[PDB]
Design a protein around this ligand. Structure first.
Ligand code: NAG
Ligand code: NAG
Ligand code: NAG
Ligand code: NAG
Ligand code: NAG
Ligand code: NAG
Ligand code: 8WY
Ligand code: CL
Ligand code: CL
Ligand code: NA
Lengths: 343, 189
């Protein structure tokens, strides 16, 4: 009710899922078991945001060894993909051709193999129940359903679960996910292999291909979640911050914070409107300097990013950009030197 | 995108961000398995597609078989010099994720806002291209004034800017917060 807890805590975007995380902890799960259990739930209650058809990254800290690690389970382009495969935004956003190889379940598996304390099946149990029984639609999902009402109502396979009497579900109305409940049940009993190289695989490929996609059984068989033993860190006062490097945005985050740390913000930075307005102006300028360098980033396995990244986490480099922030004015785009190619 | 933060009794922690990209992904749902497929292919840059007005394609982020597309996601853990977790934080909401994660950190670490306040506090966003500062509906309007007089063109977000879930160590224990912009709520013991 105050949400200050003596022993442990789960912060998720649905109360029911934070609770499912919490119970995992109570029954002796590691922080990873709890994250997995809660994620499986969020994939049901906030089905518009995330799920087993997508990808994930986990940052994990072990208080005993004092080591942080990152698990990369983000989607990858199918093997039949190529640079000029799309000719409109619509082609990249809708239908089977827009689908990248899902990494979610391989990510849960790796994380669980390294850090799990509860049995795999136990992590699925409460979400199987929830998907079968149903739940009232939450605030976030109801707004997403509204936003995309037209597309949902015109697509009978989405209307099957996301409508009631041919119109999108509203907040408070009951959402049931009977097919997903069965898929979760299969995953819980057969493990991750059921999705990638097992009893669900041919159906996955058939569904993606029927909607115009190009994902094959080989794509799924070959997918691997990746352990990263040395995540990005930066020093901030007496603390360190761990976060994912490229292809994620830890280097942008690092650059924003390293720019701003040389201003020595404190309570006083927001105490009067004069300080407050200058402080927020400096924040926007650091956003703009950091987003300037973002366009050089990509998957480090395909693009050499090591020098870009070394700059973006350098304090000296950040002090250089800080000295170009004017207190009295913002600037045109070219001032920040956005770059699309290395020098 | 969805973000969640976890701290366990032994002090270990997980910051997990997960995504199918746009709302409902590709809009392709399996009638058999019920899986809703991502449209993460759209996170790649294309030489063809008009990105926005005057935003060009990024060659580092072009489609190659087996490549991962660039992401805004950034699940973070902050640990103090003594080895104890200080903050577990991340965000959802497309391209506003990195800026909102930065703001939550700034708000708690430097402005001294408690975790609920740091999550609930109005946010703003600028990503250089496009060239506009988006501010939330209930931002302090002195801040809007300070930006406009420094020549920022601002506009108000029709909905909200990102979603943040956070946990912060306090003398009283582990203080948690979920973002009311999405309707979440924490749980613990
Ligand atoms: C777009 O054009 C390219 C090159 O002409 C072609 O190979 C590709 O199949 C096209 N994609 C779509 C979705 O029409
Ligand atoms: C942290 O590392 C220790 C020692 O290597 C290990 O015993 C323990 O299982 C790890 N903790 C978690 C939560 O995985
Ligand atoms: C499972 O893996 C093997 C390779 O070890 C492969 O030959 C087979 O096609 C895969 N099965 C499915 C259902 O994808
Ligand atoms: C932070 O990263 C740097 C560069 O990779 C590395 O030298 C150092 O060991 C890391 N610091 C911590 C606290 O993990
Ligand atoms: C790194 O920063 C230095 C300036 O500090 C600059 O000379 C160099 O071009 C930068 N390298 C890249 C790849 O951005
Ligand atoms: C971007 O906005 C700034 C702020 O007013 C302005 O100086 C500039 O002319 C705008 N356009 C470009 C192309 O930078
Ligand atoms: C649903 C998430 O907000 C989308 C995030 C985007 N695909 C990315 O930057 O990874
Ligand atoms: Cl379903
Ligand atoms: Cl979220
Ligand atoms: Na709270």
């Amino acid at each position: 009710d105050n949400h200050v807890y003596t022993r442990a805590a789960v912060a998720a975007d649905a109360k029911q899922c934070s609770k499912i995380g919490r119970d995992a902890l109570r029954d002796g799960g590691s922080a990873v078991d709890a994250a997995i259990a809660a994620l499986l739930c969020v994939g049901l209650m906030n089905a518009h945001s995330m799920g087993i058809g997508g990808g994930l990254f986990l940052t994990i800290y072990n208080s005993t060894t004092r080591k942080a690690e990152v698990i990369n389970a983000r989607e990858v382009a199918p093997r039949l993909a190529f640079a000029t495969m799309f000719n409109s935004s619509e082609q990249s956003q809708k239908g089977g051709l827009s689908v990248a190889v899902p990494g979610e379940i391989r990510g849960y598996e790796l994380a669980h193999q390294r850090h799990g304390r509860l049995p795999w099946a136990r992590l699925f149990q409460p979400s199987i129940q929830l998907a079968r029984q149903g739940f009232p639609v939450g605030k976030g999902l109801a707004a997403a359903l509204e936003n995309k009402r037209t597309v949902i109502e015109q697509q009978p396979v989405l209307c099957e679960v996301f409508c009631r009497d041919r119109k999108v579900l509203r907040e408070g109305e009951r959402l049931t996910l009977p097919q997903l409940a069965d898929t979760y049940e299969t995953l819980a009993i057969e493990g991750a292999q059921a999705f990638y190289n097992g009893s669900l695989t041919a159906q996955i490929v058939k569904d993606i291909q029927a909607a115009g996609g190009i994902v094959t059984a080989e794509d799924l068989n070959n997918y691997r979640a990746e352990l990263i033993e040395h995540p990005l860190n930066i020093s901030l006062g007496d603390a360190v911050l761990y976060m994912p490097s490229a292809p994620l945005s830890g280097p942008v985050l690092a650059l924003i914070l390293n720019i701003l740390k040389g201003y020595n913000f404190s309570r006083e930075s927001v105490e009067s409107p004069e300080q407050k307005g200058l402080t927020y102006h400096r924040i926007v300028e650091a956003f703009r300097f950091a987003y300037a360098k973002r366009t050089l980033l990509g998957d480090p396995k395909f693009v050499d990013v090591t020098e870009v990244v070394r700059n973006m986490t350098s304090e000296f480099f950040a002090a250089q950009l800080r000295a170009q922030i004017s207190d009295d004015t913002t600037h045109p785009i070219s001032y920040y030197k956005p770059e699309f190619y290395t020098p | 995108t969805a973000h969640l933060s976890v701290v366990a009794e032994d002090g270990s922690a997980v910051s997990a961000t997960s995504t199918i990209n746009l709302y409902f992904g590709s809009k392709v749902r399996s009638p058999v398995s019920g899986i809703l497929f991502n449209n993460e292919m759209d996170d790649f840059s294309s030489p063809s597609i008009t990105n926005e007005f005057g935003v060009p394609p990024s060659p580092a982020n072009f489609i190659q078989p087996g490549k991962q597309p660039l992401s805004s996601m950034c699940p973070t853990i902050m640990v103090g010099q003594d080895g104890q977790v200080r903050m577990v934080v991340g965000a959802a909401g497309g391209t506003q994720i990195t800026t909102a994660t930065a703001l939550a950190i700034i708000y708690n670490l430097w402005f001294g806002y408690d975790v609920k306040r740091a999550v609930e506090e109005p946010r703003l966003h600028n990503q250089l291209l496009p060239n506009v500062t988006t501010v939330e509906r209930n931002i302090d309007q002195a801040v809007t004034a300070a930006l406009e007089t420094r020549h920022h063109h601002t506009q108000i977000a029709s909905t909200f800017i990102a979603v943040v879930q956070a946990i912060v160590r306090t003398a009283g224990g582990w203080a948690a917060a979920s973002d009311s912009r999405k309707g979440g709520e924490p749980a613990g013991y």
